[PDB]
């Protein structure tokens, strides 16, 4: 008590507790002292003492240096031993890690990080839901041709898209056609929402590989286009037409359109082509019309779940499955937050008139974002959208990892002409279960795949004997 | 081939004759006299407009603007809604003292902390105090008042505290500004000399918003609840695991909340619909109204609506939305017995004369868009003294020394030695020496 009064008045007493005079003990090398600041540096919260609004008293403290260990459980260890943490695991000072777009190394207490290249993705989903290269989700409900994205230099390329009314009212829109202008705008390719891809107003056959770009159709419900410049396109034809565009990281700030500028800032995304930035989502979009005759639209300040009451219960009862941890989507909760997808699921299910189709289209966007960060949702079509899972042809079965180069015999004949990389796996009917797709019908085993020219039966000889897939020419 | 002054940059891929192009206003016009558009408004050639620090001009259907760097702004409001310096909205509900901003980013000159506490029973939390460390001085905004602590002996970095409208404004001569509505809202403004040298819940202010989720140890994360949890102050404070959903935990309060907050989407704010997106404010209004379930829930709603009305004013749309039945404001309480001078100014666009600005002292920001009651001092004593909220003559206002008001004539306190001071009868603070040893 005398010492406590000594310290409280303003004085600073010295140590009197000896090993034989009422000693005190603390775990580790925590030395007991009198008149020492309680504001301690703890290996994570450094520079506490600069903001110390308190006077001092007795207790167990640390030596002059050797900030107290907080992340670990040791005593007053030196500064250059602080162990790093990252969502649990305790990383030693020298162990490296590679995050999403950067790699980091645990220096003394603090990570040192360095950027890694990683591309960008614009998405046009649902009837009207546009995600730019920098997030910035917004809803448009347009009616015209629009310039989705085009290289700014003079000619490089251009990618358009037809947004138009789709049901009864103006508030139910759809994507109807995708037009690509490439090769110095000397080649026009058209994708309609019934397949029937056509080049220069002429039907074409798939696959079609050229010097500048190439197109493929791996599963009859997905058309995947690659461009030598660094553009990659995925077009989904069911249950509702959608578009995904991926760009390399060497074109940062050289793109303009409804997909933004791709420069890292998501506040100038609405920056019109004539200077200043807009405020709403429709104001900015109207300035990118490809036909002067189209009219101007305005935002819609309503929720479809309030105008169609009979649909609200249906929309909720199913779209709420995204937050149920026991459900298969519950696995993805670790990686990607489902809130935005849930809200958009309710919006689409309430709004459109083919409620099940919109439900399945919205629910199949979560199972693509999640399937891009490792976690792959296996067998999520068992209750919700199994309307066509069992309808696969004779030997075909619904697969979730149907990539491009699981193709027929001729794909193995070349095996290096069309295996474009950087394309996410997609689902659909197939059976490359070591039974390589035949020239037609059931997917035959490797033994008699074919000999691809023309595809012959498994009984021919050139002297290059016909055999399982490969040829000993 | 039919250009329209809006498809100029499009390309015309897929009436007026050749040459002239449609302008959208009427008859066909040449390219030179082609007008400009902005926020659904059509401006002819040679116009002028301002954007928050600059001025622009419609030249050839294209805007040409000056290039000066505006200040940086972070916003904290509601039951845990944050807007960083680079424009990235998010939510976070913690119960501890968190670093709002600071300069000790891996040696520093300031720090701004916040104190979040639970308000409701659904688990949400809201700010209720602020602390400002400048050099060694520590201001604290608390209980509707400003309290000085540990005032440094002789450095006393120049600051200035005053009250504008319904808000309390604290400025620092170094370039820091704090605006506080006295209940939960906070705006932090920084000068462009701090660019890319801060860190905290408000991001690092570098005109790049893909790295504002930088944790305390210089790691970039993708989760709100991990970014937030790493900036707590006391290590013993718990960690947040999930964001509560108020309207789902209080079903019976939803019907009211969705009906009162619907005014934002009504015709009353029809002018502002084309300039500020109302959805992220409607969501906040509904989120706040479902949570204030322990009393005084008519105050959570008025502030939420005011947050949007203020932005509408800031963008150039002065809207009058209060009525005797909806968030009434009681201004004439400040008037003398029955002389009528204080008036409710819906959008604060008034510049009058105080006894600070009368002596050349000027601020560095325009705060001419804050709601509240304002004076209209008469013509027989037209100088508004602030520390007493009084209209007085140009002679008898005060001295304003060391951020402390002293009435004219009153012997000015002085923390010096042998130096007495007095406010003259001319609003002039003057000091004399006393040889009682010491000299002049
Ligand atoms: C507005 O900003 C200016 C710019 O610094 C401030 O002027 C500074 O004032 C302090 C003390 O009054 C001086 O030490 C600095 O040298 C001044 N700056 C310059 C560049 O000369 C001014 O104080 C700010 N406004 C207010 C009300 O403080
Ligand atoms: C798809 O995944 C399944 C997992 O059961 C497995 O057959 C294989 O990894 C993939 N199938 C292929 C590549 O044909
Ligand atoms: Ca951008
Ligand atoms: Ca930043």
Residue numbers in the entry:
A (entry chain A): 270 to 721, 724 to 733, 739 to 749
B (entry chain C): 780 to 793, 801 to 892, 897 to 1226, 1237 to 1240
What are the paper's exact sentences on this?
One extracellular protein family that arose through domain replication and gene duplication is the gel-forming mucins, huge glycoproteins that coat and protect the epithelia in the lungs, intestines, and other organs. A remarkable variation on the theme of mucins arose with the evolution of the complex vasculature in the vertebrate lineage. von Willebrand factor (VWF), a glycoprotein responsible for hemostasis, has a similar domain organization and is homologous to mucins in its amino- and carboxyl-terminal regions. Under acidic conditions, the amino termini of mucins and VWF form noncovalent intermolecular interactions that juxtapose VWD3 assemblies from different CTCK-linked dimers. We present residue-resolution structures of VWF and MUC2 amino-terminal segment tubules, enabling comparison between them and an analysis of the features that stabilize each one.
We subsequently discovered using dynamic light scattering (DLS) that a dimeric MUC2 amino-terminal fragment spanning the D1D2D3 region but lacking CysD1 could also self-assemble, but only at a lower pH. Remarkably, in TEM samples prepared at pH 5.4, the D1D2D3 fragment exhibited tubules that resembled the VWF tubules found in WPBs, both with diameters of ∼25 nm. The VWF and MUC2 tubules also both display twofold symmetry perpendicular to the helix axis. They differ, however, in that the VWF tubule is a one-start helix, whereas the MUC2 tubule is a two-start helix. The MUC2 tubule has a helical twist of ∼83.2° (about 4.3 subunits per turn) and an axial rise of ∼6.95 nm per subunit. Due to the larger axial rise of the two-start compared to the one-start helix, a helical turn of MUC2 (its lead) extends almost 30 nm along the helix axis, whereas a turn of VWF extends only about 12 nm. The MUC2 and VWF tubule maps indicated contacts between one helical layer and the next, which in MUC2 are made between the two separate, intertwined helices. The MUC2 helix map showed additional interturn contacts not seen in VWF. In the MUC2 tubule, C8-1 modules from each bead contact one another, with an interface area of less than 200 Å2. The MUC2 tubule also has a second contact between helical turns (gray arrows). The MUC2 tubule thus appears to be stabilized mainly by quaternary interactions between turns of the helix, whereas the more rigid packing of the bridge in VWF appears to dictate the geometry of its tubule.
